[PDB]
Amino acid sequence: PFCVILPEIQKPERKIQFKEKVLWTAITLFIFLVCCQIPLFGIGTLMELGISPIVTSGLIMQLLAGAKIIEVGDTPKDRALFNGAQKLFGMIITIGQSIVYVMTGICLLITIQLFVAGLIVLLLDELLQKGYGLGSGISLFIATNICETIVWKAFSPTTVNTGRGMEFEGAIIALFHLLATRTDKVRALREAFYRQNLPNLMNLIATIFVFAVVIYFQGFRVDLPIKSARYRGQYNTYPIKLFYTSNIPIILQSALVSNLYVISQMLSARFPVGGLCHYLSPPESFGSVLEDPVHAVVYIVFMLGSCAFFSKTWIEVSGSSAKDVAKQLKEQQMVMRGHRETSMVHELNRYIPTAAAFGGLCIGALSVLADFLGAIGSGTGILLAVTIIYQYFEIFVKEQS
């Protein structure tokens, strides 16, 4: 009864040609970045909440789907009652976030416009999901990253802050202006402990370096033969990718184990910036062991462990296990080239478990390269750009073909 009330986009009357579908994205991408400035009416932008409330409710409803609290059906009816329900959770969660974003610290006017801002993107999202190759929830995570990257990398704000400088006062300080004056005498930059802080441009090439190693691991996958039933030798493949889990929920856990740990020390005072946080979170000192070795030992292993642990649990929930994939295939009538159905479980199972974890253990160490590097992205979500980048180009090739 609720799914009928809310709006959906018409499935296009026929096929659409790529020149049009590409020009639909000039529209939505123009409109998102038009939305990512204009400040709300507090006498700050329109895109304050973003798609993250819809994504996270997506994850909450996917874990309710996966934990078997609410039943999931590959049949279109149980999906037809669920695909609207998910969008409804996406509709409520942006109202919930309209309250939650404001409450922590004029109001109702602002909540209406944050609600409208979250609402508009939910449709702009579905537009791309029918009249374009790829969705949108995705697209925005590119859009609001590569811009911030190139602004913070080759825009003029070295003048102030951590971001470039190496000057004790104002002076002349733009990313390119120092590349004209550092060429004359010493760069000052070599393999050593260094003055620390300094600028960011030198970091920048590191940020390109983890970019250029991420791409390598975005290739990495295992292939399992898949010939459907009822079709002589038509060789479809199924990829188990090294990363898997898209390693999205693992870093969310990495944030959550920081959010539960750092509040429960403030809960204990009512019934420590030093002791408790001095063993958990990193030193953010450029060097390896530095002055304090114990800060360096506890931070790493625990993160790579707790990231992995959460990966291996994720799979037990959001389908993507041994047992579930099989179902998923069995539905669409697919099989291993020479096996009885059941055996599938076994023959691919020995690929999933390892992956689920080993991805995590490769992403924990990649947060470590990003933190130790102090890279310009300063995070794991450089990955996220390239994942999507790959996906987009592949469409450009599909539509080229």
Partner: peptide, 19 residues
């Protein structure tokens, strides 16, 4: 399944630490 309920209970705080 206890460890799975703790995962959902963790995930719930993600929505509480958006702020």
């Amino acid at each position: 399944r206890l460890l799975l309920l703790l995962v959902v209970s963790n995930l719930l705080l993600c929505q509480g630490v958006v702020s």
